[PDB]
Amino acid sequence: GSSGSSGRSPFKVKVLPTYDASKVTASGPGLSSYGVPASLPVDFAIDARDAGEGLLAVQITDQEGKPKRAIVHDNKDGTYAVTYIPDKTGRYMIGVTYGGDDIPLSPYRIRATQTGDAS
């Protein structure tokens, strides 16, 4: 089941938005394919060329799918930084979104390289 359909407007055209998720990309250690240090404060960079401006949001989950703490850094220089401390190593799935629209790049598959953690 579902419901809603809320929100109206007295005047609004059907033109194209200035922003564009598709034009959104990210680079850095936080998304390093080679691997990332477990229990280490890592952050990536979001450089937008033709993505314009759009509500950015990050969702970090674990192999089980638990909510992870994600900090938001504002540079106001045409980019966006995000720090995340992966405590519980494992398959991490990051779901980046811009202006209520997920990019064709996400989700993101990363592996937290941990050592020891004997139980």
CATH number (domain holding residue 60): 2.60.40.10
Dist CA 36 CA 3 (whole Å): 41
φ and ψ at residue 52, rounded to 5 degrees: 65, -140
Helix or strand or coil: residue 102?
strand
Which of 59, 57, 58, 66 has the alpha carbon at shortest distance from 89? 66
Residue 106 covered by a domain: yes
- DSSP secondary structure letters along 31-97: G-SS-EETTS-EEEEEEESS-----EE--EE-TT-----EEEEE--SSEEEEEE---S-SEEEE--E
Q: Tell how far CA 49 is from the center of its chain.
A: 17
The experimental method, as deposited, was NMR
Give the Å distances, CA to CA, from 111 to 48, 65, 71, 76, 91: 25, 14, 20, 30, 6
Residue 8 covered by a domain: no
| DSSP run (H or E) holding 109 | strand 108-113
DSSP code for 27? E
Helix or strand or coil: residue 6?
coil
DSSP code for 105? T
Residue 2 covered by a domain: no
Residue 11 covered by a domain: no
Residue 12 covered by a domain: no
For the chain, the domain total comes to: 1
Give the Å distances, CA to CA, from 58 to 22, 65, 100: 16, 14, 11
What are the tokens at 111? Answer: 């592996």
Identify whether the C-beta of residue 114 lies closer than 8 Å to the C-beta of residue 80.
no
